[PDB]
Design a protein around this ligand. Structure first.
Ligand code: NAG
Length: 398
């Protein structure tokens, strides 16, 4: 007689993203398929010396939120989206991969107050239901991609506490957190911040690095196993790490990638940093040759720079490749699909893993069985005719 309610929180790369590229078309989204939209991204005016976005270096706006023209214009369509789905909640996500300014914004009482005032101003001007902070990452700085300091852990908590106090009742405060095991251990006081957050979005993807083949495997592959311990990740492992650190499952949304990645293992030696004279003794070697890298290059994917491939492009360019160069497979342990390309020798080479309707439904089944609060996905612009979002909505009963 009583039915559970799951969330489906769809990121949309509207403004542009360092790794996913230019922003998409908000008009193509089906907002009836989701519960929450994270419009991405607000940026942060900052004094980091390595900032290359000159707009963000305006010293009169230090620590405030920056909204690009495209972001402003898209946020103007909110009334139309709300008419199509009057239950929809819309948040602005601030930060994203490579986004500077959190370490400075969070550092002092005065800096925190400026940031918070800016958050309040943006919520009010654009009539948002809340704010999502996507700081990559406190303390670690994504290994120097953004400035960081050890005080970031404590300061993130203070920032969230003070933002929670400032926000109107009813406004949502959320964050996205990293897959890396050091996130709950060292970077983010997850127990400390939990009281201030409506939910926590887990970035349970981007695992196709180092000696790992799969990008968003639910469990570890056995057929295509990761070699170095420090690289061995799955969505469930991440979930378990956050739960071990003291978060309740109902507060968590599992991140689902509407995209795939060509693993780094295909093109770069894989180093196990636990081994003797590690860099001279790689534990995997690249298996792509110029023949393979050229196929991807011709698609528009330069594997020396990036490995991201949107799901709609996987369908149109890989699955439906007129020359039939890609073969689709299912990994029964990892519960995701992957494609192989045939080497000149005739051997299948592992090309890319991704998510399809079947694997999305299996992640929804995990959400339901593990007792998580819902799904989050990156990102709506990468879906194919809203099919993966619709699958998620069907499987979660949204
Ligand atoms: C797009 C992305 O997430 N890249 C990161 C990278 O910063 C990092 O070097 C590695 C762990 O060292 O984890 C990868 O997932």
């Amino acid at each position: 007689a009583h039915a559970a309610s799951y969330l489906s929180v769809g990121y949309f790369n509207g403004g542009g993203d360092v790794t996913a590229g230019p922003g998409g078309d908000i008009n193509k989204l089906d907002v009836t398929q989701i519960t929450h939209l994270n419009y991405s991204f607000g940026l942060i005016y900052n004094d980091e010396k390595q900032e290359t976005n000159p707009a963000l270096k305006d010293p009169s706006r230090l620590h405030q939120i920056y909204l690009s023209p495209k972001v402003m214009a898209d946020l103007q369509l909110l009334p139309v989206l709300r008419k199509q789905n009057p239950e929809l909640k819309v948040l602005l996500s601030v930060g994203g991969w490579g986004a500077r300014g959190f370490s400075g914004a969070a550092a002092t009482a005065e800096s925190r107050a400026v940031f918070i005032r800016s958050v309040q101003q943006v919520i009010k001007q654009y009539h948002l239901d809340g704010i999502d902070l996507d700081w990559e990452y406190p303390v670690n700085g994504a290994w120097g991609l953004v400035e960081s300091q050890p005080a970031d852990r404590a300061n993130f908590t203070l920032l969230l506490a003070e933002l929670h106090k400032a926000l109107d009742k009813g406004k949502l405060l959320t964050i996205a957190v990293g897959a890396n095991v050091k996130s709950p251990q060292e970077w983010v006081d997850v127990k400390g911040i939990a009281p201030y957050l409506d939910y926590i979005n887990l970035m349970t993807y981007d695992m196709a690095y180092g000696t790992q083949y799969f990008n968003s495997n639910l469990y570890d592959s056995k057929q295509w196993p990761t070699v170095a311990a420090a690289d061995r990740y799955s969505a469930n492992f991440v979930v378990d790490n956050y739960l071990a650190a003291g978060l309740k499952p109902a507060q968590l949304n599992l991140g689902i990638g509407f995209y795939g990645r060509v693993p780094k293992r295909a093109t770069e030696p894989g180093i196990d940093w636990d081994k003797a004279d590690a860099a001279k003794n790689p534990v995997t070697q690249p298996y792509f040759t110029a023949r393979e890298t050229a196929v991807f290059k011709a698609m528009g994917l330069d594997l020396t720079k990036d490995s991201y491939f949107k799901y709609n492009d996987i369908v149109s360019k890989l699955l439906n490749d007129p020359q039939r160069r890609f073969t689709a497979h299912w990994d029964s342990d990892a519960q995701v699909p992957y494609l192989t390309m045939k080497s000149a020798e005739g051997k299948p080479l592992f090309a890319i893993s991704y998510e399809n309707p079947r694997s999305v439904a299996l992640k929804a089944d995990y959400i339901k069985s593990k007792g998580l609060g819902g799904a989050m996905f990156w990102e709506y612009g990468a879906d194919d005719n809203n099919r993966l979002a619709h699958q998620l909505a069907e499987s979660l009963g949204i």
